[PDB]
Amino acid sequence: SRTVITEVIATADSQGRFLNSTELQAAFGRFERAVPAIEAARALTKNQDALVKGAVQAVFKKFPYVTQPGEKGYGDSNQAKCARDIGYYLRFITYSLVASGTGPLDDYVIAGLREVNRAFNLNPLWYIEALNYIKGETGKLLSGQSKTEALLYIDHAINALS
Amino acid sequence: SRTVITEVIATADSQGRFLNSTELQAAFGRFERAVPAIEAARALTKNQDALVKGAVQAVFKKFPYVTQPGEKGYGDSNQAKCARDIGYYLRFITYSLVASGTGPLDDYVIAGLREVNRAFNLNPLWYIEALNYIKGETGKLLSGQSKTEALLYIDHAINALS
Amino acid sequence: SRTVITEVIATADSQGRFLNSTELQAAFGRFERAVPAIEAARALTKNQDALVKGAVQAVFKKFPYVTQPGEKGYGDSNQAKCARDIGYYLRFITYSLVASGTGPLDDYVIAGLREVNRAFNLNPLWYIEALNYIKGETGKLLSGQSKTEALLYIDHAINALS
Amino acid sequence: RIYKITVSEAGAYATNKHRTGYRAPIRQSNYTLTVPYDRFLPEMIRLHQSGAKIVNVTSV
Amino acid sequence: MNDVFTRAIAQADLKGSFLLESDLDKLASFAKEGVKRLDAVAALTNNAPAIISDAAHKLFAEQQELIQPGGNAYPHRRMAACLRDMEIILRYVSYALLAGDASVLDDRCLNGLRETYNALGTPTQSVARAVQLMKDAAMVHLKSTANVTVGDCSSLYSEAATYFDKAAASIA
Amino acid sequence: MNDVFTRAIAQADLKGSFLLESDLDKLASFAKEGVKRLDAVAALTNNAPAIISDAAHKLFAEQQELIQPGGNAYPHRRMAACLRDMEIILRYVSYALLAGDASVLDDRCLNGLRETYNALGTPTQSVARAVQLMKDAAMVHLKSTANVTVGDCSSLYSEAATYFDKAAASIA
Amino acid sequence: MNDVFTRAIAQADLKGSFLLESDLDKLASFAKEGVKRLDAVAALTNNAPAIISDAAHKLFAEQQELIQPGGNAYPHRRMAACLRDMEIILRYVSYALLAGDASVLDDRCLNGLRETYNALGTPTQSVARAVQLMKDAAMVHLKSTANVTVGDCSSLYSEAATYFDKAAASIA
Amino acid sequence: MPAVVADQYLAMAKELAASRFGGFTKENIPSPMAQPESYGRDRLGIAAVATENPKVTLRAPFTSEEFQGALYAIYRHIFGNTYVMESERPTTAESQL
Numbered sequence A, B, C: 001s002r003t004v005i006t007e008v009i010a011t012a013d014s015q016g017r018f019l020n021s022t023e024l025q026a027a028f029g030r031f032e033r034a035v036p037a038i039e040a041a042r043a044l045t046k047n048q049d050a051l052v053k054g055a056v057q058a059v060f061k062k063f064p065y066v067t068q069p070g071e072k073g074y075g076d077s078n079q080a081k082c083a084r085d086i087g088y089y090l091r092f093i094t095y096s097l098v099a100s101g102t103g104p105l106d107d108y109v110i111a112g113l114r115e116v117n118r119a120f121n122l123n124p125l126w127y128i129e130a131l132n133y134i135k136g137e138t139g140k141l142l143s144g145q146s147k148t149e150a151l152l153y154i155d156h157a158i159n160a161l162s
Numbered sequence D: 001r002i003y004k005i006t007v008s009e010a011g012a013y014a015t016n017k018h019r020t021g022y023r024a025p026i027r028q029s030n031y032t033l034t035v036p037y038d039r040f041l042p043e044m045i046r047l048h049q050s051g052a053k054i055v056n057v058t059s060v
Numbered sequence E, F, G: 001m002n003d004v005f006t007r008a009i010a011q012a013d014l015k016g017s018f019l020l021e022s023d024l025d026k027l028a029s030f031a032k033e034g035v036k037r038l039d040a041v042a043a044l045t046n047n048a049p050a051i052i053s054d055a056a057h058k059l060f061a062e063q064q065e066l067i068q069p070g071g072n073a074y075p076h077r078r079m080a081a082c083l084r085d086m087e088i089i090l091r092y093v094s095y096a097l098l099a100g101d102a103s104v105l106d107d108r109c110l111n112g113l114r115e116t117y118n119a120l121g122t123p124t125q126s127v128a129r130a131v132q133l134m135k136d137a138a139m140v141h142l143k144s145t146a147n148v149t150v151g152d153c154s155s156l157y158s159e160a161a162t163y164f165d166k167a168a169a170s171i172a
Numbered sequence H: 001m002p003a004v005v006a007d008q009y010l011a012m013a014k015e016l017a018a019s020r021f022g023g024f025t026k027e028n029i030p031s032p033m034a035q036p037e038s039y040g041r042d043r044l045g046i047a048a049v050a051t052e053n054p055k056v057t058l059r060a061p062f063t064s065e066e067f068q069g070a071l072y073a074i075y076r077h078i079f080g081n082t083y084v085m086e087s088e089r090p091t092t093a094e095s096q097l
């Protein structure tokens, strides 16, 4: 996936050249960023369940009409799919934090997202609200540099939803 | 010129996208590496006279025939050309250190280097010996990671010549 | 605009020859049943205002949450913009009817529709419901092949919104 | 002979790009294409078909 | 493209002299504030859709001519082009902020934009007003001290204002 | 093309699972040995001309039939393609060494290499010999204690050896 | 790509004489029923999102291994690819229905499609199942007697059934 | 009641189920067809030419590195993947470019 190391290697390769000093400094920056990013991944993995259930409840609070019958969020199966989707998003955010790139989000979430949302009439505002709750909670589960990394990736997902 | 910020902007721009986590990680790595690089630039700037004089002398030691009549090292104009060229190499190396990238060396030295040397019958091995002397003397001048930064740039120049 | 006459001429020019039998008499296919299209456009034009008000009411009935404060529906200004948008769609349906081609729809509505709705957070299902209401009302206002013509154009817009 | 054609893309080109889409990156409006005599007619026909408007044509 | 480091290097190359101590000091200071610069760039990037939305809403509240039929942004395609242009100018302003030199913005985009807008019939004043409203919207996000370590970043505000205003001057 | 991190991510995704504590520990260990990895990659990159030069010298001393009329390195064009191949294999070995995964070799470097050499009638045993000689020459520069901090980098030695052996085994 | 008329003409040309009176009666009858044929093609065109949403929902109900991690429709990319393929195959079936012949479908759509899916690791039997479900939804929409003059169209239903069944058989 | 399992195995079970959302349910199982997202392009060997290498674009003004990389990509595509020697390199054409 498109991560710092992979971009480095692929850009150098498509230009038929070795890895220069700039590319190695990018790699060094990635290796330094690994510590806060992996600690943030640890924090979001540890608290995944409360995070996702709170995010689903936040979605239902901002979008009360959804739970009523005849629309998307009525019924146990639909809400279970909701929790599964937000779990997917959180999982891929943690993958991005580990890889230090938007690669996993781009490959697994961002690509083809709008077409799927139109095909199944899934409103992106739902997922944006869930990610906003995740953002608010990771503001209280992390601190310092890890907080900034997690926020970076969550905002990346939000910006690509809107 | 090819710098870390340059590669960031170019890669994010060709894909028509805003900057993101991987790109800012590379920029952070560059800004972190800046301090040893500017340290090395200051160190090489203070010792340009001794470094260039010693490099010229090392070239004449390694290729004595150069100084004999009928060859390239005969005449004070040619000696001044030699010292001038080595001063150019050192100056562009410090430029590379400051910009944190092989951009200056690439644009101002490497591009066109082969055909220029072929046209004027300049032997690359002369410049490789000069740069090897400078590489040796950076160890006695620099210590830490500044030495490593200077060495990657000098080795880049040497590889470009080789 | 992608009119059938326009496509006649475009195919002629692309293949770079004169207007042959297939192509002239394909234009004749248009010229035959343009009259039902013109009559449908006229009938839509007279009953335009009731159609627009009914479609706005249908949008509000199918999406009652929208009218509540804090979102798009709230405000007489937004009510008016809803009416204006439904009027725009109806006007361009009439244009496509009289032109006997969807080109007015594909250049005044469809081209850039998704990006505009995404940037202004306009749910395409609102306009789909309004168009479905207008479809129901043209079912009773229009009879004969004229109705069929109108319906297709309406449905085309619907298929653009999904 | 060589012909320089200064073409400025216009709304007729913009509508075509809005329908078809940018399989290639977006570029500025006005630019010049240098063609030989042999290619000149196909080049003009293509620019006309795409909706592009020629600012002028010069010879050299 | 060109950055501030490359700018200093190019100037020192024209005189054929090494980078003077003062130039090294200035570039080292720039590398010291590069962290704050990264925060500012991320602030612009992470709120780009919100900046564009607020600017467009404020503009079309100001100028109803563009929306109404016959305006320069009336149909959906021209609205989409308007929004895409504001998007692109924000992206280039953010690139210039990261670089610290407006070369990235001045060479590729601004040189042809005057001619493009003149040919297409757009009112350049409206585009400049859109860029100014965008600057006002993005200033709010650049001010935000939430989630970032509180400090002084008035230099970054001034540089971002320079980028936005001289971009507008290129359009205006 | 994957690194170690994206390989771990793909495995966890196949499980449908967040990364485990132990997986994150192994990944943080990989990223903490990163500077030694960078030094090894720089040693490969910086000494590449020497590596290809002495490898080619040894190979054409051992296998003189390659440079005879009728050999596969005889005219300058074939010799130049030979040196380009050695250059390329070394470059992709350094890519793999930085990535920590040998996915770049089989995705890119060796994607059709054996079929290529069989079509051309190149003796694949000589290419294996050339890659082995490049491994031998590389190991001297990797182990060089000169001008880097002293420490244990034997895992990097083994990893580079495995990458070279993978190239050799895929060719032959 | 040829229609019913060009098919008749090619068969006549192969034997090398004029179209017989029976052939011309067949083709005139086809043109007389072409109005109902246009109704059927309109039914397929206006209801494509409905048909494909229904087919996708049924398909991912019957086959859950497709939409779960590791499945071939798991991430949004492959899910979008699946729905896109459904759109494409429905499009070519409607083309063939208008043509009165399945030459456009076979020649332009289904010819290397099994080979493509086999190379990508896509279950061709699942694709065939999706085409069957999409045929069922399409046949529900074709039979709709609203907005259209009532009359017999059994030949058209059977023909659309053969086009979908041929697509399924060609994929699987 | 005495413990029925050792605490180490309880910890292992808890942390295996902690890495799933929802732990172990019938609805959230991994797909038996264990295909990564990059399965197809990786098994075909077309990952590089289809998704990874960027589309190289060259406009009227450009720097040295953009020009040189564009030339490398052009020569690696147009001339197949065949080695073009320096004597074969077209100089006037790229000067006009």
Ligand SMILES: CCC1=C(C)/C(=C/C2=NC(=C\c3[nH]c(/C=C4\NC(=O)[C@H](C)[C@H]4CC)c(C)c3CCC(=O)O)/C(CCC(=O)O)=C2C)NC1=O
Binding pocket: C021, C024, C025, C026, C028
């Ligand atoms: C597929 C292309 C095409 C052809 C080949 C064609 C021939 C054509 N011309 C017609 C009428 C006509 N055609 C003409 C044109 C002629 N009057 C003068 O003599 C001039 C020589 C010429 C004027 C340029 C006129 C005046 C009529 C009768 C007007 C009317 O229908 O009320 C009709 C209607 C008669 C019928 O079908 O019962 C046909 C089919 N129409 C077509 O759409």
Ligand SMILES: CCC1=C(C)/C(=C/C2=NC(=C\c3[nH]c(/C=C4\NC(=O)[C@H](C)[C@H]4CC)c(C)c3CCC(=O)O)/C(CCC(=O)O)=C2C)NC1=O
Binding pocket: C059, C066, C072, C073, C078, C079, C081, C082, C083, C085, C088, C089, C108, C109, C116, C120, C121, C122, C126, C127, C130, E057, E060, E067, E073, E074, E075, E076, E079
């Ligand atoms: C000629 C083609 C064309 C169309 C179709 C069009 C639609 C359109 N309506 C808009 C405003 C709006 N449109 C609505 C519509 C909503 N109001 C609610 O009562 C309903 C649920 C719903 C309508 C069914 C609302 C609330 C706004 C204002 C909020 C915003 O700026 O996004 C906007 C944003 C800019 C503006 O017009 O002020 C567009 C582009 N514009 C065009 O140039």
Ligand SMILES: CCC1=C(C)/C(=C/C2=NC(=C\c3[nH]c(/C=C4\NC(=O)[C@H](C)[C@H]4CC)c(C)c3CCC(=O)O)/C(CCC(=O)O)=C2C)NC1=O
Binding pocket: D011, D014, D015, D017, D018, D026, D027, D028, D029, E066, E072, E073, E077, E078, E079, E081, E082, E083, E085, E086, E088, E089, E108, E109, E113, E116, E120, E121, E122, E123, E126, E127, E130
């Ligand atoms: C390098 C970066 C770059 C820029 C900056 C750029 C500008 C640009 N804007 C264009 C169209 C346009 N741009 C606008 C936007 C204006 N209309 C007003 O309402 C607004 C106030 C204002 C936006 C802020 C509009 C309406 C069009 C469509 C013109 C038309 O179709 O008549 C076009 C024509 C190409 C096309 O539409 O496909 C270009 C080239 N192109 C580039 O490649």
Ligand SMILES: CCC1=C(C)/C(=C/C2=NC(=C\c3[nH]c(/C=C4\NC(=O)[C@H](C)[C@H]4CC)c(C)c3CCC(=O)O)/C(CCC(=O)O)=C2C)NC1=O
Binding pocket: A145, A148, B021, B024, B025, B028, E035, E036, E038, E039, E040, E042, E043, E142, E143, E144, E145, E148, E149, E150, E151, E152, E153, E156
């Ligand atoms: C991957 C991308 C990346 C980001 C985003 C990043 C943010 C970042 N913000 C920091 C603190 C800071 N952040 C800021 C900027 C904020 N302060 C004010 O509130 C302004 C409103 C605002 C600027 C828009 C400042 C002034 C500091 C203090 C650093 C200093 O100057 O001493 C630091 C240094 C603190 C430390 O780690 O010990 C970093 C590295 N680093 C990265 O590698």
Ligand SMILES: CCC1=C(C)/C(=C/C2=NC(=C\c3[nH]c(/C=C4\NC(=O)[C@H](C)[C@H]4CC)c(C)c3CCC(=O)O)/C(CCC(=O)O)=C2C)NC1=O
Binding pocket: F057, F060, F067, F073, F074, F075, F076, F079
């Ligand atoms: C068909 C065209 C063709 C040519 C021309 C050719 C020349 C050629 N000579 C070589 C070796 C060599 N050639 C020389 C020639 C030097 N010896 C000294 O007495 C002289 C000053 C000088 C020659 C004028 C030397 C020293 C080497 C060994 C270089 C080395 O091993 O590094 C090599 C390297 C491979 C090898 O060891 O054989 C080539 C490719 N090969 C070809 O296939």
Ligand SMILES: CCC1=C(C)/C(=C/C2=NC(=C\c3[nH]c(/C=C4\NC(=O)[C@H](C)[C@H]4CC)c(C)c3CCC(=O)O)/C(CCC(=O)O)=C2C)NC1=O
Binding pocket: A021, A024, A025, A028, B033, B145, B148, B149, B152, F035, F036, F038, F039, F040, F042, F142, F143, F144, F145, F148, F149, F150, F151, F152, F153, F154, F156
């Ligand atoms: C610009 C690109 C760049 C490079 C090249 C780079 C290398 C680099 N090598 C380092 C030390 C080192 N370098 C090596 C590698 C060597 N040790 C020897 O035994 C082996 C022959 C050889 C490979 C095994 C080792 C073992 C260390 C010490 C380990 C450590 O730093 O934690 C350090 C940390 C210095 C310290 O904290 O004391 C860096 C940053 N960093 C960069 O940003």
Ligand SMILES: CCC1=C(C)/C(=C/C2=NC(=C\c3[nH]c(/C=C4\NC(=O)[C@H](C)[C@H]4CC)c(C)c3CCC(=O)O)/C(CCC(=O)O)=C2C)NC1=O
Binding pocket: A059, A066, A072, A073, A074, A078, A079, A080, A081, A082, A083, A085, A088, A089, A108, A109, A116, A120, A122, A126, A127, A130, G057, G060, G067, G073, G074, G075, G076, G079
């Ligand atoms: C790898 C990343 C990935 C994501 C994120 C993803 C989301 C996703 N969710 C889906 C279903 C769904 N998802 C939802 C979510 C809704 N439930 C309501 O309670 C909430 C308001 C709301 C969530 C916030 C619903 C209702 C469905 C069922 C829609 C249908 O009828 O098909 C579907 C359609 C396929 C299926 O039936 O399972 C996808 C593709 N798929 C992916 O491959």
Ligand SMILES: CCC1=C(C)/C(=C/C2=NC(=C\c3[nH]c(/C=C4\NC(=O)[C@H](C)[C@H]4CC)c(C)c3CCC(=O)O)/C(CCC(=O)O)=C2C)NC1=O
Binding pocket: C144, C145, C148, C149, C152, G032, G035, G036, G038, G039, G040, G042, G142, G143, G144, G145, G148, G149, G150, G151, G152, G153, G156
């Ligand atoms: C825009 C393209 C176009 C359409 C849409 C079109 C529809 C169309 N359908 C017609 C009649 C008809 N349409 C049908 C078809 C229906 N029978 C069953 O209900 C089926 C559900 C369904 C088709 C599968 C039938 C059986 C007739 C009566 C026979 C005839 O008049 O040809 C007629 C002749 C006038 C009439 O009797 O009302 C037209 C023009 N013509 C066109 O040029």
Ligand SMILES: CCC1=C(C)/C(=C/C2=NC(=C\c3[nH]c(/C=C4\NC(=O)[C@H](C)[C@H]4CC)c(C)c3CCC(=O)O)/C(CCC(=O)O)=C2C)NC1=O
Binding pocket: F066, F072, F073, F077, F078, F079, F081, F082, F083, F085, F086, F088, F089, F108, F109, F110, F111, F113, F116, F120, F122, F123, F126, F127, F130, H081, H082, H083, H084
């Ligand atoms: C993915 C990276 C990549 C690789 C690995 C690669 C290898 C490669 N080597 C080639 C030719 C060649 N390769 C060799 C080298 C071999 N023959 C000698 O015996 C040596 C023992 C041995 C080298 C150590 C030679 C001599 C040729 C030229 C064959 C000929 O012209 O007949 C060719 C054919 C290109 C052409 O001739 O136009 C390719 C594609 N290309 C790439 O883009």
